[PDB]
A paper describes a structure:
We chose a derivative of DMAP as the artificial cofactor due to its low steric demand, which will facilitate its inclusion into the protein scaffold. The protein host around the cofactor was rationally designed on the basis of high‐resolution crystal structures obtained after each variation of the amino acid sequence. The system was evolved through repeated cycles of mutagenesis, activity tests, and structure determination. According to the presented structures and calculations the catalytically active site is too shallow to undergo interactions with 1.
We describe here the use of an artificial cofactor employing the well‐known biotin‐streptavidin system to catalyze a Baylis‐Hillman reaction. As protein host, we chose streptavidin, as it can be easily crystallized and thereby supports the design process. There are several examples using streptavidin as the host for these cofactors, since its natural ligand biotin binds strongly (K d∼10−15 M) and is easy to modify with catalysts at the carboxylic acid group.
Numbering used by the authors:
A (entry chain A), D (entry chain A): 15 to 136
B (entry chain B), C (entry chain B): 15 to 135
């Protein structure tokens, strides 16, 4: 309910998601950055019965960066929580793993943090 | 290919996954550590057309730590890659986020690394 | 250049640092969050000859959470870069490791991100 | 005492460190991987009065990847703990930040994990 909708992060990427009764997140992700174009399938999970003490709602989702137009041989997982209120927000940290050989595994994973709100960028 | 089946990490957790033709990962996770018991639903994605240059196959999945027995108000995502061969493995790094108040948000996320193999430790 | 001085992050912590000619960072950290009080010693390194292409200046530092008042048996490292300009900032990600038994090692490391500015929040 | 010495990680990198009475780590790092050659200065901190319940000793250190031969405009911090015993070990996770513009900040930080032991590679 509160999670379902269209969200945008600080890069201008577009996160369209539906939070289902079974605890699943399903939708599409469009990244404004990197080796990506148009929409990618996402799937994830969220806590469908969160605490009522003011705590956020834990969640996560994955995008593999392959669609009909491009394959960047990589995947990002976002782990975070939804925080409701006047300015609802999803605060995340993410891990992006690139397909790599063994000589290059050490350099295979980027880390970052994305904040999502429902405010469409200008 | 090669991803579908049962995998074990260094903690003894059991990762049961099916890699579908549409790039989907679907299965169950049983953690040997933390506030967890029995199996939890997992869903994720993998590169269904990986490079042919010897690179691994990038993938990720999520578990929310709620099932019919308990709810630990948290979720873990594993991000990594499958590497095939005689000693196949899925090498991952993970982020566990706990549902938290704003006063405790700074301390809400654990990070780690799990190595999954076809043979238990 | 531009690094030496007092900085504040979004939690209200105070980062007092001197960037030396030898690439060293030296100063004190006062955390507004966690098991911490008063100042802690910090030491780190920065690129003393950064690129001239508009890139930030890479740097990192460590605090062990022991001083003469308390010891929280943990240490944080911040890894990031200084970006100069009208709204200068040091953008970081951090890893806090707690001294832990092997049974709790999987849960020993927190991860986060701190943005430091010259103006308090 | 237990921390002071020469350590090697799974990549074959060489970590020469002295743990001082003031809580400081000082020494040199030589990376077997990446845009690095010869030795780099490191500095860090460790818990000089760790717990006595079997817990490890928390510590961290930083290398900026500039020396007299090369500058890779980047820095790595390792955060971890020393675990004593028959096979003493330093278990770490690390963050490597590369100098970047604003268009590229999202991709500026690699993450990984290094295990150090005193066994010299063959
Ligand atoms: O780029 C992608 C796919 C798109 C990822 C978009 C990322 S997901 C976390 C963050 N949040 C967003 O909303 N968007 C970004 N994958 C590899 C390709 C090789 N990489 C580079 C980087 C820089 N230059 C050249 C090559 C590293 C990343
Ligand atoms: O334990 C779980 C759920 C099971 C996580 C299992 C983890 S997934 C990565 C790793 N790989 C595995 O195979 N297993 C482990 N959630 C905790 C998180 C930490 N929590 C707190 C809260 C307050 N203070 C301290 C800690 C709250 C609940
Ligand atoms: O709090 C501190 C020391 C101060 C850390 C302050 C942190 S540094 C990154 C961030 N940026 C700041 O400016 N401030 C915060 N150490 C804790 C770690 C968590 N600990 C446990 C143990 C068991 N269960 C749960 C948690 C043990 C002690
Ligand atoms: O490489 C370095 C400096 C050496 C880092 C060595 C790393 S520290 C953590 C790990 N533990 C070790 O012992 N060693 C490795 N810095 C940038 C340069 C640009 N980068 C690449 C990567 C791959 N191809 C091309 C360019 C990313 C990294």
């Amino acid at each position: 309910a509160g999670i379902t909708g269209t969200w945008y992060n600080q890069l201008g990427s577009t996160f369209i998601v539906t939070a289902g009764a079974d605890g699943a997140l399903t939708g599409t992700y469009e990244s404004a950055a990197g080796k990506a174009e148009s929409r990618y399938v996402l799937t994830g999970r969220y806590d469908s019965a969160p605490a009522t003490d003011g705590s956020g709602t834990a969640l996560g989702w994955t995008v593999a960066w392959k669609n009909n137009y491009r394959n960047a041989h990589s995947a990002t997982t976002w782990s975070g929580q939804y925080v409701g209120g006047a300015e609802a927000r999803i605060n995340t940290q993410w891990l992006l793993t690139m397909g790599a050989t063994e000589a290059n595994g050490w350099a295979s994973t980027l880390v970052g943090h994305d904040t999502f709100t429902k405010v469409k960028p200008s």
